[PDB]
Design an enzyme around this catalytic site. Sequence first.
Site, PDB file in Angstrom:
ATOM      1  N   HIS A 200       0.831  -1.203   0.000  1.00  8.06           N
ATOM      2  CA  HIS A 200       0.000   0.000   0.000  1.00  8.06           C
ATOM      3  C   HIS A 200       0.859   1.245   0.000  1.00  8.06           C
TER       4      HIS A 200
ATOM      5  N   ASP B  94      10.518  22.179 -24.807  1.00  4.89           N
ATOM      6  CA  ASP B  94      10.380  20.846 -24.238  1.00  4.89           C
ATOM      7  C   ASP B  94      11.278  20.806 -23.017  1.00  4.89           C
TER       8      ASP B  94
ATOM      9  N   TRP C  65       7.248  -0.495   4.671  1.00  9.49           N
ATOM     10  CA  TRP C  65       7.874   0.175   3.541  1.00  9.49           C
ATOM     11  C   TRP C  65       9.260   0.670   3.910  1.00  9.49           C
TER      12      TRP C  65
ATOM     13  N   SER D 251      14.794   6.260 -11.999  1.00  7.45           N
ATOM     14  CA  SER D 251      13.821   7.056 -12.768  1.00  7.45           C
ATOM     15  C   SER D 251      13.774   8.488 -12.227  1.00  7.45           C
ATOM     16  N   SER D 252      13.685   8.631 -10.899  1.00 10.05           N
ATOM     17  CA  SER D 252      13.503   9.940 -10.274  1.00 10.05           C
ATOM     18  C   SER D 252      14.800  10.730 -10.251  1.00 10.05           C
TER      19      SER D 252
ATOM     20  N   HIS E 291      13.101  11.235   5.283  1.00  7.43           N
ATOM     21  CA  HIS E 291      12.420  12.481   5.670  1.00  7.43           C
ATOM     22  C   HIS E 291      12.414  13.423   4.441  1.00  7.43           C
TER      23      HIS E 291
ATOM     24  N   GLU F  64      12.118  12.590   1.557  1.00  8.18           N
ATOM     25  CA  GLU F  64      11.060  12.036   0.712  1.00  8.18           C
ATOM     26  C   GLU F  64       9.684  12.630   1.058  1.00  8.18           C
TER      27      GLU F  64
ATOM     28  N   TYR G  64       8.977  15.564   2.116  1.00  3.62           N
ATOM     29  CA  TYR G  64       8.893  16.928   1.590  1.00  3.62           C
ATOM     30  C   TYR G  64       8.839  16.894   0.065  1.00  3.62           C
TER      31      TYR G  64
ATOM     32  N   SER H 200      -0.495  26.925  -4.465  1.00  4.02           N
ATOM     33  CA  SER H 200      -0.268  28.342  -4.711  1.00  4.02           C
ATOM     34  C   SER H 200      -0.926  28.784  -6.008  1.00  4.02           C
TER      35      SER H 200
ATOM     36  N   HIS I  43      14.227  12.017  13.868  1.00  3.76           N
ATOM     37  CA  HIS I  43      12.927  11.978  14.576  1.00  3.76           C
ATOM     38  C   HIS I  43      12.128  10.729  14.213  1.00  3.76           C
ATOM     39  N   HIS I  44      12.599   9.913  13.277  1.00  2.00           N
ATOM     40  CA  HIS I  44      12.015   8.583  13.066  1.00  2.00           C
ATOM     41  C   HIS I  44      12.680   7.521  13.920  1.00  2.00           C
TER      42      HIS I  44
ATOM     43  N   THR J  36       6.881  26.738   7.027  1.00  2.00           N
ATOM     44  CA  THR J  36       5.619  26.140   6.566  1.00  2.00           C
ATOM     45  C   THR J  36       4.452  27.051   6.931  1.00  2.00           C
TER      46      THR J  36
ATOM     47  N   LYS K 281       3.916  29.809   4.485  1.00  4.13           N
ATOM     48  CA  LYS K 281       3.143  29.454   3.282  1.00  4.13           C
ATOM     49  C   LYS K 281       1.660  29.415   3.595  1.00  4.13           C
TER      50      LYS K 281
ATOM     51  N   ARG L 244       1.131   0.373  15.443  1.00  2.00           N
ATOM     52  CA  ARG L 244       1.121   0.190  14.004  1.00  2.00           C
ATOM     53  C   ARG L 244       1.386  -1.241  13.591  1.00  2.00           C
TER      54      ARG L 244
HETATM   55  C1  HEA Z   1       3.553  14.902   3.047  1.00  2.20           C
HETATM   56  C2  HEA Z   1       4.159  14.091   3.955  1.00  2.20           C
HETATM   57  C3  HEA Z   1       4.631  14.618   5.252  1.00  2.20           C
HETATM   58  C4  HEA Z   1       4.903  15.908   5.652  1.00  2.20           C
HETATM   59  C5  HEA Z   1       4.823  17.263   4.902  1.00  2.20           C
HETATM   60  C6  HEA Z   1       5.302  15.737   6.975  1.00  2.20           C
HETATM   61  C7  HEA Z   1       5.646  16.872   7.770  1.00  2.20           C
HETATM   62  C8  HEA Z   1       6.037  16.806   9.125  1.00  2.20           C
HETATM   63  N1  HEA Z   1       6.209  15.665   9.832  1.00  2.20           N
HETATM   64 FE1  HEA Z   1       5.929  13.771   9.209  1.00  2.20          FE
HETATM   65  N2  HEA Z   1       5.667  11.905   8.542  1.00  2.20           N
HETATM   66  C9  HEA Z   1       5.240  11.477   7.310  1.00  2.20           C
HETATM   67  C10 HEA Z   1       4.830  12.331   6.273  1.00  2.20           C
HETATM   68  C11 HEA Z   1       4.927  13.761   6.352  1.00  2.20           C
HETATM   69  N3  HEA Z   1       5.297  14.439   7.424  1.00  2.20           N
HETATM   70  C12 HEA Z   1       5.296  10.075   7.130  1.00  2.20           C
HETATM   71  C13 HEA Z   1       4.908   9.332   5.870  1.00  2.20           C
HETATM   72  C14 HEA Z   1       5.694   9.584   8.366  1.00  2.20           C
HETATM   73  C15 HEA Z   1       5.861   8.121   8.862  1.00  2.20           C
HETATM   74  C16 HEA Z   1       6.972   7.294   8.256  1.00  2.20           C
HETATM   75  C17 HEA Z   1       6.766   5.826   8.711  1.00  2.20           C
HETATM   76  O1  HEA Z   1       7.142   5.608   9.850  1.00  2.20           O
HETATM   77  O2  HEA Z   1       6.293   5.017   7.886  1.00  2.20           O
HETATM   78  C18 HEA Z   1       5.935  10.712   9.183  1.00  2.20           C
HETATM   79  C19 HEA Z   1       6.465  10.576  10.530  1.00  2.20           C
HETATM   80  C20 HEA Z   1       6.847  11.764  11.279  1.00  2.20           C
HETATM   81  C21 HEA Z   1       7.502  11.617  12.516  1.00  2.20           C
HETATM   82  C22 HEA Z   1       7.951  10.355  13.302  1.00  2.20           C
HETATM   83  C23 HEA Z   1       6.841   9.964  14.283  1.00  2.20           C
HETATM   84  C24 HEA Z   1       7.198   8.558  14.755  1.00  2.20           C
HETATM   85  O3  HEA Z   1       7.399   7.627  13.964  1.00  2.20           O
HETATM   86  O4  HEA Z   1       7.211   8.315  15.950  1.00  2.20           O
HETATM   87  C25 HEA Z   1       7.712  12.909  12.947  1.00  2.20           C
HETATM   88  C26 HEA Z   1       8.367  13.195  14.204  1.00  2.20           C
HETATM   89  O5  HEA Z   1       8.838  14.280  14.391  1.00  2.20           O
HETATM   90  C27 HEA Z   1       7.191  13.814  12.001  1.00  2.20           C
HETATM   91  C28 HEA Z   1       7.120  15.269  12.160  1.00  2.20           C
HETATM   92  C29 HEA Z   1       6.663  16.106  11.044  1.00  2.20           C
HETATM   93  C30 HEA Z   1       6.704  17.512  11.125  1.00  2.20           C
HETATM   94  C31 HEA Z   1       7.124  18.273  12.362  1.00  2.20           C
HETATM   95  C32 HEA Z   1       6.367  17.950   9.871  1.00  2.20           C
HETATM   96  C33 HEA Z   1       6.295  19.438   9.549  1.00  2.20           C
HETATM   97  O6  HEA Z   1       6.932  19.562   8.238  1.00  2.20           O
HETATM   98  C34 HEA Z   1       4.867  20.002   9.599  1.00  2.20           C
HETATM   99  C35 HEA Z   1       4.997  21.561   9.584  1.00  2.20           C
HETATM  100  C36 HEA Z   1       3.558  22.128   9.395  1.00  2.20           C
HETATM  101  C37 HEA Z   1       2.913  22.810  10.402  1.00  2.20           C
HETATM  102  C38 HEA Z   1       3.449  23.066  11.805  1.00  2.20           C
HETATM  103  C39 HEA Z   1       1.519  23.290  10.009  1.00  2.20           C
HETATM  104  C40 HEA Z   1       1.458  24.700   9.360  1.00  2.20           C
HETATM  105  C41 HEA Z   1       2.019  25.783  10.309  1.00  2.20           C
HETATM  106  C42 HEA Z   1       1.352  26.882  10.810  1.00  2.20           C
HETATM  107  C43 HEA Z   1      -0.108  27.166  10.521  1.00  2.20           C
HETATM  108  C44 HEA Z   1       2.184  27.828  11.672  1.00  2.20           C
HETATM  109  C45 HEA Z   1       1.961  27.797  13.179  1.00  2.20           C
HETATM  110  C46 HEA Z   1       2.392  26.477  13.792  1.00  2.20           C
HETATM  111  C47 HEA Z   1       3.144  26.343  14.906  1.00  2.20           C
HETATM  112  C48 HEA Z   1       3.669  27.535  15.681  1.00  2.20           C
HETATM  113  C49 HEA Z   1       3.459  24.939  15.408  1.00  2.20           C
HETATM  114  N4  HEA Z   1       6.664  13.072  10.992  1.00  2.20           N
HETATM  115  C1  HEA Z   2       0.573   8.979  -0.455  1.00  4.59           C
HETATM  116  C2  HEA Z   2       0.533   8.081   0.541  1.00  4.59           C
HETATM  117  C3  HEA Z   2      -0.658   7.407   1.140  1.00  4.59           C
HETATM  118  C4  HEA Z   2      -1.977   7.586   0.841  1.00  4.59           C
HETATM  119  C5  HEA Z   2      -2.620   8.472  -0.259  1.00  4.59           C
HETATM  120  C6  HEA Z   2      -2.642   6.657   1.658  1.00  4.59           C
HETATM  121  C7  HEA Z   2      -4.065   6.470   1.596  1.00  4.59           C
HETATM  122  C8  HEA Z   2      -4.690   5.596   2.587  1.00  4.59           C
HETATM  123  N1  HEA Z   2      -4.106   4.860   3.536  1.00  4.59           N
HETATM  124 FE1  HEA Z   2      -2.165   4.649   3.915  1.00  4.59          FE
HETATM  125  N2  HEA Z   2      -0.223   4.427   4.340  1.00  4.59           N
HETATM  126  C9  HEA Z   2       0.836   5.064   3.724  1.00  4.59           C
HETATM  127  C10 HEA Z   2       0.688   6.025   2.674  1.00  4.59           C
HETATM  128  C11 HEA Z   2      -0.578   6.449   2.132  1.00  4.59           C
HETATM  129  N3  HEA Z   2      -1.799   6.015   2.512  1.00  4.59           N
HETATM  130  C12 HEA Z   2       2.115   4.725   4.282  1.00  4.59           C
HETATM  131  C13 HEA Z   2       3.476   5.282   3.834  1.00  4.59           C
HETATM  132  C14 HEA Z   2       1.834   3.832   5.243  1.00  4.59           C
HETATM  133  C15 HEA Z   2       2.742   3.105   6.290  1.00  4.59           C
HETATM  134  C16 HEA Z   2       3.190   1.763   5.648  1.00  4.59           C
HETATM  135  C17 HEA Z   2       3.983   0.967   6.705  1.00  4.59           C
HETATM  136  O1  HEA Z   2       3.655   0.947   7.895  1.00  4.59           O
HETATM  137  O2  HEA Z   2       5.023   0.391   6.359  1.00  4.59           O
HETATM  138  C18 HEA Z   2       0.415   3.727   5.290  1.00  4.59           C
HETATM  139  C19 HEA Z   2      -0.228   2.928   6.313  1.00  4.59           C
HETATM  140  C20 HEA Z   2      -1.682   2.896   6.406  1.00  4.59           C
HETATM  141  C21 HEA Z   2      -2.361   2.218   7.435  1.00  4.59           C
HETATM  142  C22 HEA Z   2      -1.749   1.572   8.653  1.00  4.59           C
HETATM  143  C23 HEA Z   2      -1.470   0.115   8.443  1.00  4.59           C
HETATM  144  C24 HEA Z   2      -0.870  -0.432   9.777  1.00  4.59           C
HETATM  145  O3  HEA Z   2      -0.159   0.219  10.656  1.00  4.59           O
HETATM  146  O4  HEA Z   2      -1.135  -1.680   9.991  1.00  4.59           O
HETATM  147  C25 HEA Z   2      -3.697   2.352   7.157  1.00  4.59           C
HETATM  148  C26 HEA Z   2      -4.788   1.823   8.011  1.00  4.59           C
HETATM  149  O5  HEA Z   2      -5.908   2.323   7.939  1.00  4.59           O
HETATM  150  C27 HEA Z   2      -3.794   3.095   5.979  1.00  4.59           C
HETATM  151  C28 HEA Z   2      -5.035   3.411   5.320  1.00  4.59           C
HETATM  152  C29 HEA Z   2      -5.159   4.250   4.191  1.00  4.59           C
HETATM  153  C30 HEA Z   2      -6.427   4.574   3.629  1.00  4.59           C
HETATM  154  C31 HEA Z   2      -7.762   4.066   4.137  1.00  4.59           C
HETATM  155  C32 HEA Z   2      -6.089   5.418   2.626  1.00  4.59           C
HETATM  156  C33 HEA Z   2      -7.144   6.055   1.745  1.00  4.59           C
HETATM  157  O6  HEA Z   2      -7.346   7.406   2.258  1.00  4.59           O
HETATM  158  C34 HEA Z   2      -6.909   5.991   0.246  1.00  4.59           C
HETATM  159  C35 HEA Z   2      -8.204   6.539  -0.425  1.00  4.59           C
HETATM  160  C36 HEA Z   2      -8.032   6.875  -1.887  1.00  4.59           C
HETATM  161  C37 HEA Z   2      -7.329   7.909  -2.379  1.00  4.59           C
HETATM  162  C38 HEA Z   2      -6.607   8.924  -1.567  1.00  4.59           C
HETATM  163  C39 HEA Z   2      -7.316   8.126  -3.843  1.00  4.59           C
HETATM  164  C40 HEA Z   2      -6.240   7.290  -4.456  1.00  4.59           C
HETATM  165  C41 HEA Z   2      -5.644   8.184  -5.505  1.00  4.59           C
HETATM  166  C42 HEA Z   2      -5.996   8.222  -6.794  1.00  4.59           C
HETATM  167  C43 HEA Z   2      -7.059   7.327  -7.368  1.00  4.59           C
HETATM  168  C44 HEA Z   2      -5.320   9.146  -7.746  1.00  4.59           C
HETATM  169  C45 HEA Z   2      -6.268   9.505  -8.895  1.00  4.59           C
HETATM  170  C46 HEA Z   2      -5.490   9.967 -10.112  1.00  4.59           C
HETATM  171  C47 HEA Z   2      -5.646  11.141 -10.749  1.00  4.59           C
HETATM  172  C48 HEA Z   2      -6.611  12.199 -10.347  1.00  4.59           C
HETATM  173  C49 HEA Z   2      -4.796  11.485 -11.929  1.00  4.59           C
HETATM  174  N4  HEA Z   2      -2.542   3.399   5.491  1.00  4.59           N
HETATM  175 CU   LIG Z   3      10.404  12.710   8.986  1.00  3.87          CU
END
Ligand code: HEA
Ligand code: HEA
Ligand SMILES: [Cu+2]
Lengths: 46, 84, 43, 259, 227, 58, 514, 79, 79
Positions: free
Chosen positions: G61, G91, G126, G156-157, G240, G242, G244, G255, G290-291, G316, G319, G438
């Site tokens: 998934h 292009d 993953w 690819s990327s 991490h 990734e 962003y 935007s 932080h992971h 952030t 923005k 999890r």
């Molecule tokens: C689009 C994907 C995305 C993005 C943008 C982020 C953004 C952030 N993530 Fe996260 N993160 C994930 C996807 C993402 N994350 C994924 C996939 C995992 C799990 C990986 C795995 O284990 O499988 C994860 C796990 C993860 C962890 C580990 C938790 C754990 O495993 O125990 C942490 C810990 O610090 C973290 C922190 C943050 C923070 C601080 C940001 C910041 O960048 C957010 C900053 C944004 C704001 C704060 C909101 C806007 C701000 C304002 C309106 C201003 C005012 C706010 C304040 C003064 C606070 N993320």
């Molecule tokens: C982009 C990343 C992404 C997205 C979109 C999703 C979408 C969803 N995820 Fe995902 N999920 C992950 C990334 C994502 N997840 C990751 C990284 C993990 C952790 C894996 C791990 O632990 O190792 C995770 C783990 C995770 C768990 C925890 C499993 C566990 O700990 O045992 C669960 C459980 O509910 C869950 C549920 C869902 C559901 C219900 C959705 C739904 O919201 C999805 C619904 C449908 C959509 C959002 C639309 C799909 C998109 C399209 C059809 C595009 C269409 C195309 C065009 C318009 C051109 N996810």
């Molecule tokens: Cu991170």
Amino acid sequence: HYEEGPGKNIPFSVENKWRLLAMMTLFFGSGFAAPFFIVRHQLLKK
Amino acid sequence: ASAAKGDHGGTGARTWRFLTFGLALPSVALCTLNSWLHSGHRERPAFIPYHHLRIRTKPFSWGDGNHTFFHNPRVNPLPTGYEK
Amino acid sequence: ITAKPAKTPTSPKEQAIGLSVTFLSFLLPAGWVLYHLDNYKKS
Amino acid sequence: HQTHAYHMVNPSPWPLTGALSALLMTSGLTMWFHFNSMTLLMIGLTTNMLTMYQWWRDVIRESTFQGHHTPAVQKGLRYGMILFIISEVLFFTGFFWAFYHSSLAPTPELGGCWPPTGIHPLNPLEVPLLNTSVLLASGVSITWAHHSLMEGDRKHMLQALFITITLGVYFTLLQASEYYEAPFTISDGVYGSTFFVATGFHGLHVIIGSTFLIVCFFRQLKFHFTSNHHFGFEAAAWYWHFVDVVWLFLYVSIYWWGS
Amino acid sequence: MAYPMQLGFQDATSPIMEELLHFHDHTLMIVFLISSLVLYIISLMLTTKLTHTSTMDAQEVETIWTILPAIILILIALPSLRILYMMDEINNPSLTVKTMGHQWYWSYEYTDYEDLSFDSYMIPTSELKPGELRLLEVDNRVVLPMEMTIRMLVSSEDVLHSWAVPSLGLKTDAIPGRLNQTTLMSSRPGLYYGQCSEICGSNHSFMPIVLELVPLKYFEKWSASML
Amino acid sequence: FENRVAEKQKLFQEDNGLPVHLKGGATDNILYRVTMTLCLGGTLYSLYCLGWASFPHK
Amino acid sequence: MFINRWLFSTNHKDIGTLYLLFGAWAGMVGTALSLLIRAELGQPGTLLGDDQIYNVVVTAHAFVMIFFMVMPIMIGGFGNWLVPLMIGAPDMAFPRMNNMSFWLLPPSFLLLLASSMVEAGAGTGWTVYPPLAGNLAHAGASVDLTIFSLHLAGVSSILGAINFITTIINMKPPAMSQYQTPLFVWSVMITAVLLLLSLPVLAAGITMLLTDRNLNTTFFDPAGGGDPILYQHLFWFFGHPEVYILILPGFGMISHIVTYYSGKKEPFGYMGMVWAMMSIGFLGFIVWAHHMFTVGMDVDTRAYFTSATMIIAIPTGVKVFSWLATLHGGNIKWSPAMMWALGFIFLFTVGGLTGIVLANSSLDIVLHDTYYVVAHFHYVLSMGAVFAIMGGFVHWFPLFSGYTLNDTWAKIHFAIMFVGVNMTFFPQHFLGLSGMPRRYSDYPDAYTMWNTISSMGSFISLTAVMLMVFIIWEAFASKREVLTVDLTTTNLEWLNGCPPPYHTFEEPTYVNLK
Amino acid sequence: KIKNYQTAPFDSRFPNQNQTRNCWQNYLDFHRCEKAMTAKGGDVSVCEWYRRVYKSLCPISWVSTWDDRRAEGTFPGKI
Amino acid sequence: KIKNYQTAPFDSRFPNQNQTRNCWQNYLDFHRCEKAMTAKGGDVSVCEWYRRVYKSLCPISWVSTWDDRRAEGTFPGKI
Ligand code: HEA
Ligand code: HEA
Ligand SMILES: [Cu+2]
Ligand SMILES: CCCCCCCCCCCCCCCCCC(=O)OCC(COC(=O)CCCCCCCCCCCCCCCCC)OC(=O)CCCCCCCCCCCCCCCCC
Ligand SMILES: CCCCC/C=C\C/C=C\C/C=C\C/C=C\CCCC(=O)O[C@H](COC(=O)CCCCCCCCCCCCCCCCC)COP(=O)(O)OCCN
Ligand SMILES: CCCCC/C=C/C/C=C/CCCCCCCC(=O)O[C@H](COC(=O)CCCCCCCCCCCCCCC)COP(=O)(O)OCC[N+](C)(C)C
Ligand SMILES: CCCCCC/C=C/CCCCCCCCCC(=O)O[C@H](COC(=O)CCCCCCCCCCCCCCC)COP(=O)(O)OC[C@@H](O)CO
Ligand SMILES: CCCCCC/C=C/CCCCCCCCCC(=O)O[C@H](COC(=O)CCCCCCCCCCCCCCC)COP(=O)(O)OC[C@@H](O)CO
Ligand SMILES: CCCCCC/C=C\CCCCCCCCCC(=O)O[C@H](COC(=O)CCCCCCCCCCCCCCC)COP(=O)(O)OC[C@@H](O)CO
Ligand SMILES: CCCCCCCCCCO[C@@H]1O[C@H](CO)[C@@H](O[C@H]2O[C@H](CO)[C@@H](O)[C@H](O)[C@H]2O)[C@H](O)[C@H]1O
Ligand SMILES: CCCCCCCCCCO[C@@H]1O[C@H](CO)[C@@H](O[C@H]2O[C@H](CO)[C@@H](O)[C@H](O)[C@H]2O)[C@H](O)[C@H]1O
Ligand SMILES: CCCCCCCCCCO[C@@H]1O[C@H](CO)[C@@H](O[C@H]2O[C@H](CO)[C@@H](O)[C@H](O)[C@H]2O)[C@H](O)[C@H]1O
Ligand SMILES: C[C@H](CCC(=O)O)[C@H]1CC[C@H]2[C@@H]3[C@H](O)C[C@@H]4C[C@H](O)CC[C@]4(C)[C@H]3C[C@H](O)[C@]12C
Ligand SMILES: C[C@H](CCC(=O)O)[C@H]1CC[C@H]2[C@@H]3[C@H](O)C[C@@H]4C[C@H](O)CC[C@]4(C)[C@H]3C[C@H](O)[C@]12C
Ligand code: CUA
Ligand SMILES: [Mg+2]
Ligand code: NA
Ligand code: NA
């Protein structure tokens, strides 16, 4: 040269909307079905 | 900086050829000589079946599975020791 | 945005057809697998 | 017809054959590691070499023979090569990280020391020092080649490039002999792991770099380069200096500090 | 343990877990306020017919939305780090217990004086005694003295696991070749439950942790009956 | 050697509608068919191998 | 002609279309996997099997959603379609290498499907951590096929990143400075720099895992003096950045969407938006541990990573407030794309804020490896990345296709999806605070009510996905051809009509310097 | 003598969460001390502190493996 | 054991012309050993090999200064 314009810049035809519905249904449906059939395969193996 | 010499009056092909034949290849010749002297096979050390060495978690995908790719019988023991 | 009128307009009846076909193409194969889960687990 | 200076490329099969060659090499490695067969891997290696040959042949056709490398196009290729080298530096950075992680905190299985108990490192003053002089020397000779080319001197460009390639080959043969002579192996714990995977990926890049210089050598024999336009030579020299700098870091890190 | 329809943390059983609850309360207030302010301001921007579409100057207002969040971050980081460091404080334990993860159960070693060790397996649902908890009970509980500072050492004999007890604020990964330390102190007797918290294969879901906290004299009687 | 770049320039600029990868003449088609045959055949072969590896083999 | 055009392409628009098709198909796969997850958890007990088959589904998934759905859509699809148009370029810099970035992805996906069909699959997460992912606990080909899948996706990327950086730096009109390019172009350039630097480190890490599995190396094996935690450092050094990479192109599309439907000629605070994206990109490389707050690192290291992670909130937040200030004073057009963008702003903010909760290493002891993390990242991914994708898709579909969508249906689709994602993920905060781990196929009984509600929410999202496919069909079925589009004076990609000709900017734009 | 041992006290050499080296060091110290008292005119009771600390801190399977390797001649630490 | 001690033997840890660290190490080892033995009420006689080596190698004035600094509480090595 190649064809241009709406419905001509795509690798599938939109000439007939029902043929299109069939294509889109096989396309998206095959992607959605695959995980169900893979899970079935793994459960059936042992 | 730290070495010596002293050109830099205008860089060109003639200067880099001068460096190639007058400094770089002589260096290689000297190190080749040095290496040709300190060659000759050292005595190999007693085998001790240390468990952090001669690791085998899966057989290698060639030969009998138990020989490394550039296995040298004279200096590379198997997990069970030197070969005959 | 502005557009020309539909070259091949899709009536409400046509939409109900495409929508039903679309939904069915997702629901039937997965439903078949899920319905038969027990028949896989004992194998 | 365009009035910009950029290159609209003819539709080409090589992206697809290259992508499929990657499929065949990776599924090939899988078949080799797990199903005791080299067939798929051999096919993928062959189609990879065919793909690279025909793709870069076409780039030569497009530029030397058809004139499509305007200054703007060349500036783009300069950026692309630098970015590519950057990605290769970061690849090697991961293996240096693994090396320092293991060697700075040696675990109890090692003897809690570095090098590990039972490991007898090569002497860095012997062949590894010779290798260092070889690659540093080739950086001097490729620079001579570059200035000769810019000065319009065919004969000395060829001589200097030939010397550079010869040194790259010498390094490769010296390293092959050191691999055979090494008393430790890739299976000798994390010492062997870091040593052979890091210097092994470096060795592969030396072979790639030498191959690239060899391409340049034959293109030079065929008069492809002008005194001002020769980006394949510039790119191969940048790549060669990259390979030389990675070696220096290896030498100081793994061979010297790590002994 | 968790209870049905629970929204927040399990009740704190150690002083450190209480600190975390108070810290979470503080931080969640900020999260609620910011998320709500953003939602409000969105609705505010979208509910007037008045317009202003020429170029807007941004310098003055960006001081506000950089300095204010910076201050807020500092007001979170300060209590966060204080708790971080108080967790690390030297405490001089009176007892050391090791736990080793395995696929899929935990073993425990009490080797300060005697060489006591044992395994600890989930009770299968079909063997639960009535009123016992599905997926949480074990056959051999980690008997421990209450109101005492205990050093837990955590490792693994095969893949990664992670040793967790939420109501004590504990989660320490179990890594082969590594001996991780944490400190355990229960304010109360009872049974405290946790679950393996690093994916470790087929039965990751089914290797729980159960501590059994009893007065020192009872702990001592238990140890002595293991001889 | 002598500088024959001008002859190749004339060859590769000939207005014959060929894409650059075939413009060298008949050898290009050969090399292309070999390459594409091995890629597509190898891919089919790799699919067959997946089929094989997806089930237990006694 | 068909093969020349669609298998041998050197055209940025056609390759963008291929990426959009690929990513849409991958999205169906990843949705199906997500439904299997939630079906397993939808009532207590066991539905499919034990944690192995379950976590093969979880693992797949995540890889499908990240590598085959978000990145191909955002960077491959919208990037290739829009970036050359937005800078007047004819292009991409390397139009033929561009096609190989596309064609590496079907083999990559094939390798992933193979990993799940052979043996018992890669039930690793993953993250693919050893020793569970090693050759004793995951003997056989599954994990190796997964590694190779990532290698191909990575190549690819990386090559696509080289292409985008080169194109964006080198192919603008000569008068245009970098500070005159649209924010989406900035967001793609910065994403590409992050990919360029991070993917090689992942490749090094997963290659070491490959050799530990097949060549008897011991990088991660204590028996040889290796360390499972080194793999984690190398993985998260990429992982991490990734996340962003997953959100930055979304920031760039938001935007543009917010500006457009506010009736504005420009986003509020343009240089601030550039600063914020570059700051996020930079800070995104110095926070990865932080992971790893529960792996046993020294307290001072945990203190650093707590503090550095929280810093990212500042750019952030710039923005977020700048999008709000773009709405301010607008003649707001309540288009479907605008709805997606407004939902993005709020829901991304919520997920970002729970990210900041998690940044606190002290509280993360209790929240790590629980559903609180799952809730954090699906708010930023399922309601941020995906909402930006849907908003960009609805906004630009008439440019790419030449046809208009039915706006009422698209608004219905938004409404359904909004309910579904919030019903799916909001209760996962409670599950995490109260301690549900999890990667569990089943849970103690107390956790039943919220798992039930969450699974019901996942079905509502499925209904939205099915509806989306119907909506796309209806537009191609009815063939309402675009005439005119507003605001072309500040949205260059529309000014060659819908769809633009195969070759655009054959005669480049005229921009003088003065 | 100087006893009353409950468990291993805090050791400023090993103040962090990773205690692996603390277990290893006391295991080494005990066996180094023990070897020294046997090859000379002394008795192993002097080695007892290290014995208690490593027995307290070290996983039973680590001790058992290390013991086996000392017997085998493959123990990689110096004693 | 090894009596009929004649002089300090070759020691692979100190193979070079500079022997300062050899004198220093054996001086430390002897006094470390003597502290350990006297505390746990053992016999300093097991420390004898270190005593003979350092007395053979170390200048009298170095030993004397080091002894004076140990008694003053200013000896900078760890004992
Ligand atoms: C689009 C994907 C995305 C993005 C943008 C982020 C953004 C952030 N993530 Fe996260 N993160 C994930 C996807 C993402 N994350 C994924 C996939 C995992 C799990 C990986 C795995 O284990 O499988 C994860 C796990 C993860 C962890 C580990 C938790 C754990 O495993 O125990 C942490 C810990 O610090 C973290 C922190 C943050 C923070 C601080 C940001 C910041 O960048 C957010 C900053 C944004 C704001 C704060 C909101 C806007 C701000 C304002 C309106 C201003 C005012 C706010 C304040 C003064 C606070 N993320
Ligand atoms: C982009 C990343 C992404 C997205 C979109 C999703 C979408 C969803 N995820 Fe995902 N999920 C992950 C990334 C994502 N997840 C990751 C990284 C993990 C952790 C894996 C791990 O632990 O190792 C995770 C783990 C995770 C768990 C925890 C499993 C566990 O700990 O045992 C669960 C459980 O509910 C869950 C549920 C869902 C559901 C219900 C959705 C739904 O919201 C999805 C619904 C449908 C959509 C959002 C639309 C799909 C998109 C399209 C059809 C595009 C269409 C195309 C065009 C318009 C051109 N996810
Ligand atoms: Cu991170
Ligand atoms: C936020 C995303 C949208 C979410 C939409 C769905 C959710 C509704 C919005 C939700 C309504 C907004 C207020 C949050 C309600 C949480 C309930 C609570 O008491 O929270 C308790 C805490 C733990 O607290 C405790 O220790 C319990 C002590 C008190 C218990 C009293 C018992 C009875 C109380 C009854 C409450 C029942 C709640 C059931 C709730 C069941 C949910 C399905 O849990 C938590 O931290 C969970 C929070 C995770 C952090 C994210 C917050 C971001 C959203 C804020 C903006 C919303 C704007 C409006 C919303 C605008 C929408 C456009
Ligand atoms: C100059 C002399 C050296 C030249 C280079 C030689 C080959 C290196 C090739 C590439 C290196 C890449 C893989 C590294 C794997 C290990 C090879 C290390 C170099 C080497 O050749 O190491 C040898 C082991 O080879 C072995 O296992 C078997 C090696 C063959 C199988 C390799 C299979 C693995 C391929 C994985 C590729 C991943 C690519 C990822 C790219 C992703 C990009 C984003 C060492 O020999 P030994 O007998 O153990 O000890 C010597 C004792 N006398
Ligand atoms: C956790 C952190 C939370 C942080 C929350 C922060 C909220 C910040 C809100 C405060 C905004 C205050 C800005 C004040 C600037 C006003 C300048 C102005 O008022 O606008 C004018 C120039 O505007 C210009 O370029 C600029 C025009 C006005 C635009 C100024 C910025 C607009 C900001 C909009 C903000 C929307 C919400 C943001 C998110 C909170 C000057 O007008 P005058 O009438 O004098 O002459 C003009 C008319 N004549 C013709 C009669 C002369
Ligand atoms: C461009 C350079 C190319 C490379 C050439 C090779 C250069 C090598 C420099 C290596 C210096 C570090 C080596 C450290 C390894 C440990 C050595 C050490 O620690 O040696 C000590 C002095 O060290 C010391 O490096 C003192 C260190 C500083 C010595 C500097 C000597 C060369 C200076 C050249 C400066 C040029 C200008 C550079 C600026 C552009 C001496 O004590 P030991 O020898 O222990 O004797 C004790 C035993 O006899 C008995 O128990
Ligand atoms: C035993 C043998 C084993 C062999 C294994 C195969 C490996 C070998 C690959 C060697 C790479 C050879 C590259 C040859 C490129 C030739 C095409 C070329 O050089 O093209 C030049 C453009 O450069 C350009 O595209 C620049 C193109 C850059 C190519 C860079 C290649 C690096 C490839 C590395 C790939 C693997 C990476 C390692 C991963 C682990 C053409 O322009 P000019 O030179 O200005 O000419 C024009 C003038 O004539 C006009 O007056
Ligand atoms: C386990 C195995 C996993 C991986 C398997 C291998 C996967 C891939 C199979 C690859 C086959 C490669 C075939 C040759 C590719 C040549 C690309 C090239 O040379 O691309 C050039 C641009 O990139 C540039 O320069 C600079 C960049 C040149 C890149 C050369 C190829 C590198 C491929 C691997 C790189 C991996 C990343 C390394 C770091 C980790 C030219 O761009 P075009 O768009 O073509 O033309 C533009 C025209 O104007 C030219 O006249
Ligand atoms: C939809 C797009 C998906 C793409 C992904 C790839 C999925 C392919 C899965 C194929 O699964 C196989 O299907 C067979 C069905 O024929 C099963 O055989 C079983 O069922 C047969 C037919 O009823 C019996 O004859 C056999 O004995 C019995 O083992 C078999 O177990 C299963 O592995
Ligand atoms: C997670 C995403 C999936 C959501 C669930 C989709 C909802 C269900 C949609 C329809 O699925 C169908 O259900 C039928 C039952 O209603 C099944 O017939 C089965 O059961 C019938 C009635 O018992 C028999 O007549 C048939 O022969 C037998 O195959 C049939 O195979 C299946 O296609
Ligand atoms: C046209 C474009 C390219 C298409 C190429 C198609 C290639 C098809 C060749 C098939 O030959 C197979 O090769 C397998 C391996 O590939 C053999 O397995 C064998 O291979 C091993 C290694 O040599 C041995 O260990 C085993 O005994 C043995 O099963 C197997 O017998 C044989 O059927
Ligand atoms: C100087 C630079 C570009 C200005 C321009 O040439 O247009 C601007 C653009 C964004 C600005 C920054 C952002 O607005 C965010 C911060 C805002 C604070 O008010 C000052 C520091 C702060 C970090 C700003 C410093 C500086 O004024 C920046 C970096
Ligand atoms: C054939 C060519 C003459 C220039 C021309 O073709 O007009 C000459 C000039 C430089 C020569 C090369 C260089 O002198 C370097 C090499 C010298 C060695 O003797 C091996 C061959 C070697 C590679 C030479 C082959 C050949 O004689 C070259 C290639
Ligand atoms: Cu043990 Cu999860
Ligand atoms: Mg974890
Ligand atoms: Na040059
Ligand atoms: Na379940």
